[PDB]
Amino acid sequence: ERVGEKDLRAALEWFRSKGYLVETNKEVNPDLEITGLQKIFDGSLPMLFNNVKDMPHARAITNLFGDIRVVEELFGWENSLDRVKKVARAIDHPLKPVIIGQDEAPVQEEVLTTDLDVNKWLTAIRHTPLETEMTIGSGISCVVGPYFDGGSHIGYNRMNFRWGNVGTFQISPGSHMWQVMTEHYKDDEPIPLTMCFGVPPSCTYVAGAGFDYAILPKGCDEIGIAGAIQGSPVRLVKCRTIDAYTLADAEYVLEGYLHPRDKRYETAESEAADIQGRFHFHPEWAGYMGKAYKAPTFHVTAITMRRRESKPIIFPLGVHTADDANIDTSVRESAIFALCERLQPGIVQNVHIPYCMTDWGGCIIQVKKRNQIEEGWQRNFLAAILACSQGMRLAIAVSEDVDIYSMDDIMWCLTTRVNPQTDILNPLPGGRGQTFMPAERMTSGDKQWTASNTQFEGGMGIDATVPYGYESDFHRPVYGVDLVKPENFFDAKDIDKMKSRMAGWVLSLARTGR
Amino acid sequence: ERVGEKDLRAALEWFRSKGYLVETNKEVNPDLEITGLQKIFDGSLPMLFNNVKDMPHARAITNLFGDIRVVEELFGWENSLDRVKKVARAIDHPLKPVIIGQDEAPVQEEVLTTDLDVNKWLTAIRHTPLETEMTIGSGISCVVGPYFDGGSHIGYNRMNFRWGNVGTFQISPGSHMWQVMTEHYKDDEPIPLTMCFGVPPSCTYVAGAGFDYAILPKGCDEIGIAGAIQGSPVRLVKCRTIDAYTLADAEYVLEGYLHPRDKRYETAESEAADIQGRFHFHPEWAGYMGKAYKAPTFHVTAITMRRRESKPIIFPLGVHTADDANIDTSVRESAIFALCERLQPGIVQNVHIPYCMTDWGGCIIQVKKRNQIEEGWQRNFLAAILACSQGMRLAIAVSEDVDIYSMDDIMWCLTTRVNPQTDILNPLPGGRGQTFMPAERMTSGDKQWTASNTQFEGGMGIDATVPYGYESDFHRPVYGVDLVKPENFFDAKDIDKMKSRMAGWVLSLARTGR
Ligand SMILES: CC(C)(COP(=O)(O)OP(=O)(O)OC[C@H]1O[C@@H](n2cnc3c(N)ncnc32)[C@H](O)[C@@H]1OP(=O)(O)O)[C@@H](O)C(=O)NCCC(=O)NCCSC(=O)c1ccccc1
Ligand SMILES: CC(C)(COP(=O)(O)OP(=O)(O)OC[C@H]1O[C@@H](n2cnc3c(N)ncnc32)[C@H](O)[C@@H]1OP(=O)(O)O)[C@@H](O)C(=O)NCCC(=O)NCCSC(=O)c1ccccc1
Ligand SMILES: [Ca+2]
Ligand SMILES: [Ca+2]
Ligand SMILES: [Fe+3]
Ligand SMILES: [Fe+3]
Ligand SMILES: [Fe+3]
Ligand SMILES: [Fe+3]
Ligand SMILES: [K+]
Ligand SMILES: [K+]
């Protein structure tokens, strides 16, 4: 039980071989140093901390998915478009996970069944100095089998263990865990599930997915999609205590039960005066400071991990980082692409969810109309995307002469290609939204800022595409950037001196010439 | 007549002293090489071409205003906010221009009164290979005195001299030249004006202004604003033939008359079949390929210039460059700031028109609400900006915790802070727009794409501001980027290796920590 063929340690070895690994040996605080160093180097190389404060048996990795280029190099993709198409193909073709014995799983070298103090072994962090609680935000849930209709689910859930071996368990309403909890709410037996830590990067990648249930409904095989992404099946193992399955190649696994009707407060102040949605609880995906709520409790029965002499790795990450944004929006991009290809194939060329929009709030699709009969399909695509995403606030459709990765080019399409009377779609006013957007706090009024009181404004679908047959009038003004060579006119020093000053939309426009 | 104290040559000497000047000696074509080399190095250092093809007496400068940092260093401003405030102050305090004699003006060393072939002396360029005509797009008009109500006007006008000494003269409807032409349309005497070339950079800066006539109405002193910007009065000189005044420190001056009722076609193909708004005429400010129209004719009576042995400099520039964008939108930014400060002072903090939006299509203002009584002033500001700009299509108001120079941060505010039911303003449907936007071609139908047939959709004012009293719920999630020092944990090599991979919104977020 010491090999994990494709896991976090092999990924660290590949990162060290490629030269992408930044590793230090100095003792780092989980309090306001890991997330601070992650935000200082946001969207960059992975950082490995060998020594963690008050965690003598644990290492810590961060910014693992921060640069999307090294992630695409890890999984063998050339660019983001190839990544989107390959992960859509992997969604439609899962690899069924294999079950190995309880003696070759590396996560079951040490099995703690007593003295269950989760905060002693797992590294809880604080993100900002405005917080009061150190929370565990590193684990993915793992529901395999009868509670997920014979499929499998992996996904992140934040936990605050402020009762020793009992901690809160934050569930987004509408998610797979919400659907499992809603089905088994009125039950006597609690839901058995495991929280896995230091998982293979494919499992992190698929655990980022969410609110894409027209493509990945309840009963799908998310671990199958992770196995299809890494190109080999993800190994499972039966738990020691509960009746479930874990990722065998993880670094830590918490086994236990979820009690849905046992709801407790996440912080001490919101418990002190009984108010959800007011007190600060570590910044959220929307790009604002989060709020503390009531949440069901996760009753840990066993802590299994690797050997503490091997120093198992945990992956703590801040929420408003490019790390967290890549983790969610990559597989959500390919799911949106899959839905638009299902509705009408051959029209959508590329789907991109930038860091700027949010995890769950926005997307940009790029359509190409081949004839007059395909005119109008972008409005079907925008309405279907906004309806099938639960609280996406802004979907933008652009034409094929646009750089989809530049927000300056998107703003140019918003300025020049949008009729404000006809091209703004508000499809579903009064539907379901995401309560973590404070624009829905503005609709709750003086009631409690919970999901029961918010009112969705309906989303915003912006059709910034060129009408068919008007491609000559909306033609983009390509210059002669390949008809002239600057090496004739200037030397190397003038050329790189002028090239060092360019940044952004000029860098996008100088490649394309438009 | 050989000194111009603040002019283009002194600016070139200062650029060479600062090391910002890139100069070559190889013979460059005005056909598809100058604009190509400008787009290859878009938004960068100035380029000086000593040898121009078929122009043995002329030098050519380009990308002079391409980097806004070297422009702010030239005029003595620290950042863009200081530039906006100082140019607003200079707008409210002009320096009256001085008139010097006809023998100390350096632009009147050589006075050609016969053999007036404008294309022989002035460099006409072609931008894209899709064009057929080589046009002159380097000169600014100069109307001083009785035709501009005792004030002065400077502004660019494109000209195509396809009749020897008679060329077209493109006037935007609504502009100062349009107001002068509209007042003197039914007159027998033509309007006398001069086209000045190679002007001081302050005159280029103020000549970029347009459609800001609540702040700079007809009868204002635009040359006074140029003198206030450079800090010394701009010298004028009486013309040799016509009854007007020119910029004395220019490099070339065309003297002549504008005939408003003598309208001719700009290209040969649109003249060949009598259609405005269809055939390609060198890309425009909207970011599309332009169209050819009918335009009044400029009848050149005299060409005055510097000594041809001194090789006078002309400034040809492509239209969809950061050069052209800085030239217009800088003074238009300060004019929008001045209007918002006039309506209610102390609320607008910063105004920015990025390259991405357009010259005349968009702006971003940044407001700060000090109390509850100032809530709602951003909607007055958006409506006033959209009404007083003639065809601005998209105005966005953001709060003060936003980086106004990052379009990713603006897109984040569009995703998270806009109610699509209440925060989208469409103030003036059916007003006046700009015909060069093809979104107004979509409203002309099968009539002619002219300004007489377009129908404005009304503009789009987006209130992406935080409501007052909800700053705690919309609080931005500042991390500890100054509580931890990366020099402790890593060496220099790991630090700059990680810093070299960051670009864009991560660069904006890693300074601020949010
Ligand atoms: C939505 C709840 C849970 C509603 O609680 P409250 O309003 O306080 O109301 P109650 O709790 O009292 O229950 C009401 C009554 O209805 C019943 N009933 C309830 N549920 C069920 C059910 N499932 N099934 C069946 N029935 C159910 C039940 O009978 C109950 O009555 P009892 O209990 O029997 O007396 C609220 O706590 C909340 O706002 N949570 C936060 C929402 C959120 O957005 N989390 C996002 C995290 S993602 C983010 O971290 C992230 C994302 C990406 C990257 C990074 C980060
Ligand atoms: C707007 C016009 C000029 C209208 O012409 P048409 O539709 O063909 O119609 P007509 O010409 O036949 O005249 C109609 C009748 O009305 C009368 N009348 C007319 N005018 C006046 C008057 N002023 N005053 C009084 N009356 C006037 C007159 O009586 C006339 O009848 P007649 O003539 O007596 O029989 C059109 O040619 C056009 O679309 N131009 C392009 C517009 C444009 O946007 N240019 C933008 C350039 S900026 C860009 O380059 C840039 C910006 C930043 C950076 C970089 C680059
Ligand atoms: Ca993404
Ligand atoms: Ca600008
Ligand atoms: Fe799931
Ligand atoms: Fe459109
Ligand atoms: Fe003017
Ligand atoms: Fe708002
Ligand atoms: K998931
Ligand atoms: K002007």
Coordinates of N, CA and C in Angstrom, one line a residue, chain A residues 23 98 120 145 226 242 342 475:
Chain A
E23 N 9.4 24.9 -3.9 CA 9.3 24.2 -2.6 C 10.2 24.9 -1.6
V98 N -12.3 1.2 -10.4 CA -11.9 -0.2 -9.9 C -11.9 -0.2 -8.4
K120 N -6.5 18.3 14.9 CA -5.2 17.9 15.3 C -4.4 17.3 14.1
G145 N -22.5 4.8 -4.9 CA -23.3 3.7 -4.7 C -24.8 4.0 -4.6
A226 N -13.4 11.5 -13.9 CA -12.0 11.7 -13.5 C -11.1 10.7 -14.0
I242 N -17.6 2.6 8.1 CA -18.9 2.8 7.4 C -19.0 2.0 6.1
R342 N -25.4 19.5 -27.7 CA -26.5 18.6 -27.7 C -27.7 19.3 -28.3
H475 N -17.3 43.8 -40.2 CA -16.0 43.1 -40.5 C -14.9 43.8 -39.7

